[PDB]
Enzyme design. Sequence first.
Site, PDB file in Angstrom:
ATOM      1  N   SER B 175       4.332  -3.225   2.319  1.00  0.00           N
ATOM      2  CA  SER B 175       3.076  -3.251   1.557  1.00  0.00           C
ATOM      3  C   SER B 175       3.092  -2.137   0.541  1.00  0.00           C
ATOM      4  CB  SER B 175       1.830  -3.086   2.419  1.00  0.00           C
ATOM      5  OG  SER B 175       2.088  -2.172   3.514  1.00  0.00           O
ATOM      6  N   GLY B 176       2.402  -2.419  -0.597  1.00  0.00           N
ATOM      7  CA  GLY B 176       2.327  -1.574  -1.694  1.00  0.00           C
ATOM      8  C   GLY B 176       2.238  -2.510  -2.860  1.00  0.00           C
ATOM      9  N   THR B 180      -1.058 -10.668  -0.435  1.00  0.00           N
ATOM     10  CA  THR B 180      -2.238 -11.480  -0.345  1.00  0.00           C
ATOM     11  C   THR B 180      -2.441 -12.227  -1.688  1.00  0.00           C
ATOM     12  OG1 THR B 180      -3.230  -9.493   0.548  1.00  0.00           O
ATOM     13  CG2 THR B 180      -4.549 -11.572   0.655  1.00  0.00           C
ATOM     14  N   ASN B 235       0.827   2.817  -3.488  1.00  0.00           N
ATOM     15  CA  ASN B 235       0.035   2.300  -4.666  1.00  0.00           C
ATOM     16  C   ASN B 235      -1.513   2.166  -4.380  1.00  0.00           C
ATOM     17  OD1 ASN B 235       1.357   2.083  -7.195  1.00  0.00           O
ATOM     18  ND2 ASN B 235       0.733  -0.130  -7.381  1.00  0.00           N
ATOM     19  N   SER B 238      -2.572  -1.647  -0.009  1.00  0.00           N
ATOM     20  CA  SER B 238      -1.509  -2.027   0.853  1.00  0.00           C
ATOM     21  C   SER B 238      -2.126  -2.874   1.826  1.00  0.00           C
ATOM     22  CB  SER B 238      -0.938  -0.827   1.637  1.00  0.00           C
ATOM     23  OG  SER B 238      -0.433   0.207   0.846  1.00  0.00           O
ATOM     24  N   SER B 239      -1.383  -3.811   2.317  1.00  0.00           N
ATOM     25  CA  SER B 239      -1.754  -4.604   3.459  1.00  0.00           C
ATOM     26  C   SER B 239      -1.619  -3.887   4.738  1.00  0.00           C
ATOM     27  CB  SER B 239      -0.937  -5.866   3.604  1.00  0.00           C
ATOM     28  OG  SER B 239      -1.223  -6.650   2.478  1.00  0.00           O
ATOM     29  N   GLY B 461       3.441  -2.847   6.300  1.00  0.00           N
ATOM     30  CA  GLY B 461       4.684  -2.304   5.852  1.00  0.00           C
ATOM     31  C   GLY B 461       4.882  -0.962   6.404  1.00  0.00           C
ATOM     32  N   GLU B 463       4.145   3.092   6.203  1.00  0.00           N
ATOM     33  CA  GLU B 463       3.040   4.058   5.876  1.00  0.00           C
ATOM     34  C   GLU B 463       3.349   5.314   6.602  1.00  0.00           C
ATOM     35  OE1 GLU B 463       2.341   1.238   7.666  1.00  0.00           O
ATOM     36  OE2 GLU B 463       1.512  -0.104   6.096  1.00  0.00           O
TER      37      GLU B 463
END
Lengths: 156, 840, 88, 178
Positions: B175-176, B180, B235, B238-239, B461, B463
């Site tokens: 994620s970043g 979605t 970013n 993130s998811s 993702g 983190e």
Amino acid sequence: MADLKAAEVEKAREHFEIYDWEGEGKIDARDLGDLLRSLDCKPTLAMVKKNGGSDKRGEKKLTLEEFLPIFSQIKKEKEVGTLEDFMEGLKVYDKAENGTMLAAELAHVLLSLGERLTDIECEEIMRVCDEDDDGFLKYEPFVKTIIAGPFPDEGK
Amino acid sequence: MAEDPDPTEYLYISMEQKRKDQTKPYDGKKMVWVADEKEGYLLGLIKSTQGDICTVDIEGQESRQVKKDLLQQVNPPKYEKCEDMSNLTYLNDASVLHNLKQRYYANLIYTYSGLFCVAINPYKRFPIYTNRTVQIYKGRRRTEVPPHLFAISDGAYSAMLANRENQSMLITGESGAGKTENTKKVIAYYANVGAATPKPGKEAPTKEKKATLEDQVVQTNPVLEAFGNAKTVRNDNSSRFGKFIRIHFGPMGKLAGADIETYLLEKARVISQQTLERSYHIFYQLMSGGIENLKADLLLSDDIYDYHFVSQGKIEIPGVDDAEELRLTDTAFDILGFSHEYKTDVYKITASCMHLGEMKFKQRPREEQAEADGTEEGERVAHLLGVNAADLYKNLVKPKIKVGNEMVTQGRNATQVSYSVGGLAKAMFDRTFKWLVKRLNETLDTKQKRQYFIGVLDIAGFEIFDYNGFEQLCINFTNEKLQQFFNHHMFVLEQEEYKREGIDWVFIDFGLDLAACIELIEKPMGILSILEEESMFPKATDKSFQDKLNANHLGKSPNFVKPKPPKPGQQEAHFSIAHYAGTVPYNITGWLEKNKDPVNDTVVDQFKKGSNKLVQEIFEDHPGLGAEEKGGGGKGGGGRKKGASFQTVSALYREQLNRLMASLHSTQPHFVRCIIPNELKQPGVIDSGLVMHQLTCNGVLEGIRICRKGFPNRMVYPDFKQRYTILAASAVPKGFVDAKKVTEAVLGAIQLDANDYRLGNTKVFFRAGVLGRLEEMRDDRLGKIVTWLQAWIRWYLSKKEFKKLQEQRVALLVIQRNLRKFLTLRNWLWYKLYIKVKPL
Amino acid sequence: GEMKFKQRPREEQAEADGTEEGERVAHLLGVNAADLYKNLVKPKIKVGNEMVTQGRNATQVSYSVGGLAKAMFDRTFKWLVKRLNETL
Amino acid sequence: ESMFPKATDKSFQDKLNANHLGKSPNFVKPKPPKPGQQEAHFSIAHYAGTVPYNITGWLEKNKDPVNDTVVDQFKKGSNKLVQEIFEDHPGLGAEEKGGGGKGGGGRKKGASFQTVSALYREQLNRLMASLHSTQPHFVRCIIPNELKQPGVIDSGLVMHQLTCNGVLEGIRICRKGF
């Protein structure tokens, strides 16, 4: 066909007296195309211009002598009953080949691409083929129906 | 757009390849860069090329010559700006990323990566998302049209209709970068072919038109993005939730329905906040958007910090302000037919989750426990649930971890005080996430379950941050299972079939692969086995949770790092656990304090059920503090006063992961890779060095290297003999030429019989973009539909009517003699006389 | 019939050192000797719904050559009666 | 379920024993070898003897040893005249694609791995029931001898065929046979 036959000349001398309303000779420009269509040669409007003939009213008119080099150019090229881009020109909305495409995309793609002809003919490509309620209408039989023809041979 | 006629200019800028091509020469702008192991790119020259290996000299840094399965470097210009980037001469994910770096600034965020494609995004709209550019690439398959997510779904529409299997689009990555957002682009391609396309009009709005209602499936995704994405350390968003929409297509491929299976939405995450960032700003969509009046009515007041001065950070948004999800979600609810009265009730239970928590806008000067600025006590917790206790605040300030009726006080750092309130708000926010399933599927489905259908995952993702506990477990383990399918299908299962097909291309594996080595219940990553066994009975001793984790030895790929117990054995300090990437830190306490779920360190007695009817339906399955009562399975129920699931919630979710794995062996997966933009956040800064590190630990670089020798996608030989209508039909022979022999001539067979495709028995293995090139020739002749056949239409009409004219050839000779006799017999009269009144 | 245990490679895959044997099949279908000798040796088995293979030895391989024949003969005969029934 | 590895030879016999056995008498029961995949034997009523069956390989044949697809492309033509000879175009040489389904061909659907035997339940009803209601002329064809030759007949064969063809009953009404 793929070459002039001796009977297509003997056919064209007879059908010369039709075109001039007197019973003489002089091929009318739309009846230029009707003579090529009664001799198994069925070019497009862009192939007609390459041969240097006509298929519609208002275009050049010729005599039967003058008709022979025009008639001979179609024989060297497509559309004398050859296969390529007829029932090979249809389907692109399906990535499946079941010999079918969609009903909706078999009557408004000849009307949104193509040289564009009648809505009645758009309804014949749907009528010759089978119908199911799965949305699968065949494309490949309406073309073979044309191979069968009113006359596979030289019209009369 | 990418092709717009001149008469279609009323709302769209024209694009023409008549004369100019939109700048008649195409030209380059690339250089040779080599990937750093810090930040950014730096210059470098090629030292020597010895095939697919390429030893590099970084100019002003260092020199390498090592393997390319740990070395990644941007290709020459010629080998940038290419599709299906795994067919190149130098096998790098760095060339995909660099090509994507220049293109991100130009708002084009897809560049192929063989089967898959890499993506960098802020999780927001750009003009490439229009439906106009989808109809252009409509029936163009994988290659032929400029790289995009819509042509991945096309490449997969066709490889689904060409392998004789089902297909499953999924979103892998860290994620970043929009997952979605990228889901919308999958669902919107099937929205287009599922309602069909006759190709762009010669009209555009004047005259307001262009409507289709397949778009409402697509809008399912931004509603769930609001209850799933917020600012984090990568970013702008993130998811951090698991979305698994199984969108059903019919037995044609027409879009009709979609089944939303909700995984887990973070079980924390208002009660604690990340440092210098935020952790989830989605409870703050009624703190800066929504209905501001029903913020003060529920008894929540936060005293604004009035700008930094240091007492927080903690609280500190570096991106565009909270309530950025509030605009996305409100427009998307009305397309779905998601009631205005139904969104109001979401946001209530979300401010219910805030009353136990909060840290906004700065830390209390003696708490050391979650609470608001204004000193609201636990009275606002009790307004919606009716909780009472003589332990309800000002005794939660001191950390207490309740094991039974006892108070075992062990561990607890100062940033970790917030488990003493717990516990209900975690259990209320995930359940609110599943409320969304009961309303959105009411309007989406019109039928359900049937083939085809696509399994689409959008999970978490990588983190970093001290505070992590039970929250990201069943989010991250989903990406870990998918990471493992990407490394299974490409490396282990893929080479097993190249030994069961008599193929002499056996075992080409390049390290860091997982092949169901974490599908064991008792070796997933170590922490999740332990959560599930001790959330079954009263137990909230984290010492035992750390002790069984300190008797678990797993590893051969990132998926486990050693723990640090709260006292005995190994020291304190923040330990970590690996999933697929680096070190992911974690807290000592808070595993069973985030699942046994405290209320105010007094056992629940009826306090596990709300005082409102609306807070009451939220509770369904989840243990409460103290003793649990029997039943609760699946994700159903209607809550109980003490406990609400006798079983762990996560073990109910395990049943879906054993099943999701068996369903990806029941599908042909096409992936969408999301790679981190940068780990410093703020859009429009891509530091490829930080990305390069993530492209090495998840094993994406070995993933480029394997797509060249080996191949993931698996089709069949007779599909070149049927699917086409040009490499098929009478135009090219099918059935009279080898089905292997067609593929070999347009694409070649000059060491491309194991570098382009793996040649098996009844099946060829393609990237699934090898098919796009083959199809690229096909659509050329198919362009006009069909000008050749309209002349045959007129064949049979002129010659059939020419019959009427053929009997007129002799008739013309009779009227010409007769016209002469019209005047002859008028000089020679007394040759007529017929019945009337004149005869004699 | 007479084909079994063709793991001899020509292209780094299970085919055969035969020629004439499979050419007398090949010509009558159109498809060449290679289309034939590739696809015989093992079936693509739907496992889940995706495609895997098994190890198959001489008899296993034998039996799978016989597959190609029985699918043809059943399907031709099935077309065949029904189109002759029309005229009757 | 056989086109997928979810097919167990166990359940086959269980569903046999309900639907075929209860009112059948010359039916020889399944005794299953419990390890792995059956080499079990059973037999079913007929005028002729007991049959030792082999149960395996039945599997592979409806996962197809040589598939739908591979055959299907010899069916396909290059002037379409070829196609009519084997198919009109839905199924038998042209394919809707995808995995799933029973029967075909390529209806339904794709490489289905053929199960034409299920289609043959449907039609099987249709042949059987009309013929049920028709008034009998009958011919009960008995094996005379194996060599199939006039003036040779075996006693042992005919003895066996007639005990299973209920010859007592079969003369009790037909003692007035016309």
